[PDB]
Amino acid sequence: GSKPFSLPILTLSELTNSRFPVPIDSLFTAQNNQVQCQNGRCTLDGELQGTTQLLPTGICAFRGRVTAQINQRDRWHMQLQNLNGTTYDPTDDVPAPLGTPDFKGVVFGMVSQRNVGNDAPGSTRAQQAWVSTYSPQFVPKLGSVNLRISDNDDFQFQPTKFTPVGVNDDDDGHPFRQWELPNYSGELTLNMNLAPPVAPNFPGEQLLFFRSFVPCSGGYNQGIIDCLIPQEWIQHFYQESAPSQSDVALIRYVNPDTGRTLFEAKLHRSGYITVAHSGDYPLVVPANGHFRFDSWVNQFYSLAPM
Amino acid sequence: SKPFSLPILTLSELTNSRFPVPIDSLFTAQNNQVQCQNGRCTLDGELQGTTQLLPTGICAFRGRVTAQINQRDRWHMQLQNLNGTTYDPTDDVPAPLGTPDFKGVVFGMVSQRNVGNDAPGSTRAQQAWVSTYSPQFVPKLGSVNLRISDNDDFQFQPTKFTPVGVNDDDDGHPFRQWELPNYSGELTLNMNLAPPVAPNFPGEQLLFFRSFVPCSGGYNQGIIDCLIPQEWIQHFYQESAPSQSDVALIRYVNPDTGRTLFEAKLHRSGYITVAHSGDYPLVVPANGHFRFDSWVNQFYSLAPM
Ligand SMILES: CC(=O)N[C@H]1[C@@H](O[C@H]2[C@@H](O)[C@@H](CO)O[C@H](O)[C@@H]2O[C@@H]2O[C@@H](C)[C@@H](O)[C@@H](O)[C@@H]2O)O[C@H](CO)[C@H](O)[C@@H]1O
Ligand SMILES: CC(=O)N[C@H]1[C@@H](O[C@H]2[C@@H](O)[C@@H](CO)O[C@H](O)[C@@H]2O[C@@H]2O[C@@H](C)[C@@H](O)[C@@H](O)[C@@H]2O)O[C@H](CO)[C@H](O)[C@@H]1O
Ligand SMILES: [Mg+2]
Numbered sequence A: 001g002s003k004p005f006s007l008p009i010l011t012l013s014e015l016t017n018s019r020f021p022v023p024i025d026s027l028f029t030a031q032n033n034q035v036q037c038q039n040g041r042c043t044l045d046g047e048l049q050g051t052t053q054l055l056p057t058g059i060c061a062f063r064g065r066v067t068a069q070i071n072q073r074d075r076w077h078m079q080l081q082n083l084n085g086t087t088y089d090p091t092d093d094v095p096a097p098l099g100t101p102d103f104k105g106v107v108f109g110m111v112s113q114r115n116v117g118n119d120a121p122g123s124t125r126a127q128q129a130w131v132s133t134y135s136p137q138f139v140p141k142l143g144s145v146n147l148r149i150s151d152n153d154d155f156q157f158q159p160t161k162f163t164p165v166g167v168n169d170d171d172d173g174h175p176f177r178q179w180e181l182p183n184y185s186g187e188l189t190l191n192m193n194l195a196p197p198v199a200p201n202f203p204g205e206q207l208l209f210f211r212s213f214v215p216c217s218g219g220y221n222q223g224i225i226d227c228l229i230p231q232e233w234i235q236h237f238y239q240e241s242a243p244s245q246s247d248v249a250l251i252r253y254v255n256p257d258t259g260r261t262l263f264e265a266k267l268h269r270s271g272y273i274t275v276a277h278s279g280d281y282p283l284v285v286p287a288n289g290h291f292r293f294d295s296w297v298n299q300f301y302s303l304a305p306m
Numbered sequence B: 001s002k003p004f005s006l007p008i009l010t011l012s013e014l015t016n017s018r019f020p021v022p023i024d025s026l027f028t029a030q031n032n033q034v035q036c037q038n039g040r041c042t043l044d045g046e047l048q049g050t051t052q053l054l055p056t057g058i059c060a061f062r063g064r065v066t067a068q069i070n071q072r073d074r075w076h077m078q079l080q081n082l083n084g085t086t087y088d089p090t091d092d093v094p095a096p097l098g099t100p101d102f103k104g105v106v107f108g109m110v111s112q113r114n115v116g117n118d119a120p121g122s123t124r125a126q127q128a129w130v131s132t133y134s135p136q137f138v139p140k141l142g143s144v145n146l147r148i149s150d151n152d153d154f155q156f157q158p159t160k161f162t163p164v165g166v167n168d169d170d171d172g173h174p175f176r177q178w179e180l181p182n183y184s185g186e187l188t189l190n191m192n193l194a195p196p197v198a199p200n201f202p203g204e205q206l207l208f209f210r211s212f213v214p215c216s217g218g219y220n221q222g223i224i225d226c227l228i229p230q231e232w233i234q235h236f237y238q239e240s241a242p243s244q245s246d247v248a249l250i251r252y253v254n255p256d257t258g259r260t261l262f263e264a265k266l267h268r269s270g271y272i273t274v275a276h277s278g279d280y281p282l283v284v285p286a287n288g289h290f291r292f293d294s295w296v297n298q299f300y301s302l303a304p305m
């Protein structure tokens, strides 16, 4: 006697990217080439994995205290807390504090401070900041990241929040690479407690992504960030905790006014989608369209071509 | 009829429905007019005011910059709906969904990505401010004007505003979270508003989900109170459970002990009251959360908090 699995009923423009805090723009299927993102990872029965947490406002955000500065470009040393303000434990079974960026590049946004304690408590300030995940001081698993900021003369050793706005390539030839994980513990250390890599395991199938074009801060980068499942699905699965009756859920993309099924896809137990197609392809489908759960199938189910 | 329910979420697992940040605490306020337009949803899932579903849409703008004027609010942003579709000023809403619903300055960043003939694909981003006091703050009519940091690196191109925090204006116009902007500017009346909310039973006060949002200078506490959090709104929209009476009795429970800490009235139009007298920041366990108990009526007497 099992609680029925389901998806939330949401159009693309009603969905949030689970790897960057912006709406989904489109669906995209990619040729097979290793996909192992750590944000936007959740099993169909509601187990969050990787660095995945529940709030869109937490994705690629940091919270903590600035405690030091060094004479490097990555100047300001931020000791991290968990996003809910609780003390971060580096021995926890996670790759990094939940919400940590899961790509190589620079995240730009703003830092804000609000003093506590004896030194002008309640005083505030905010300004533009950058976090490079290429940096040798990007060591969130160990408990800290270093920030670049706009105004070094108006910044204190106080509680600090980083609010992400967009991404970009780093200079000196460090490109934005959305499928390359940072070294969460820095140079010469292996990432651990990772959500596993995902790939199609059936001939003729490709991954399907929920794609966003996020803001960039200069140059011509398209700002592409692809996620496996949107944040609202993760939030839904976490609530429902419906048992998975097989390794594969058949889902269908439906147009609610016509009632027609446009195509079908495989939603795998570990939380990603495959479709039957060959080649890079941006889908062009009706604005009111959405996936619905059809039934439980297995690994040997052959998808109708997309 | 489908049974009514709340999502099971702790305070730190909840997003403020009036500003895109997590909830920090619960607060009950002495009775003094509350008429916020974001974070408005009935228990059976009808969104109201300027309320939309995406947390990242709250206090965000999307559009095109088309002109500049020789005023502090220099850059004229013609708005689209947050999903990029054309904005219709004749729609029965107070303003485009997601528009800020308070008087003050919202600070954040603007970003552009060119299309068409001028360096297509080129991008830029910088700090920006939107004053909701501005006579050019006319989102209902289809535009707002921006202040930015660098007037020399900004084009007439597609633009997004990403909010980060709020503040008083530096000319002495205060952040007033309960004062609505004039969505159509000077000498116009706001329309299509979600109604004001207030306790209607003796001894009861409103309960808010409170956030302390970032400020950009000075000592403002950055307080933004919402009636119900964004995840509840998203839940009610999905569930569309019929409201069996005007009031859902809800209980704040400690899941580890299993004890109910206090009870409250969740009204069908989407706000909470508790039995208390005086301003009071609640201090409750981190794992605490509301659960639906039963449907009662307006005159049901709450246990004092
Ligand atoms: C510190 C400064 O004054 N930056 C200017 C500068 O920025 C350029 C520059 O960094 C070049 C490197 O040669 O890289 C970009 O071109 C960058 O500009 C950004 O990207 C281009 C494609 C445009 O979209 C531009 O608007 C954007 O800022 O020059 C730009 C003008 O091109 C601005 O003047 C910056 O402030
Ligand atoms: C334009 C400028 O020079 N900004 C400085 C400046 O800012 C001050 C100033 O604007 C006063 C005016 O009454 O208001 C604040 O004091 C403001 O500072 C901001 O608020 C105070 C409480 C601190 O938290 C401060 O860090 C914050 O910037 O002085 C500050 C240094 O105090 C900076 O130097 C700005 O760049
Ligand atoms: Mg379904």
Ligand SMILES: [Mg+2]
Pocket: B004, B005, B006, B007, B290, B291, B292
């Ligand atoms: Mg419940």
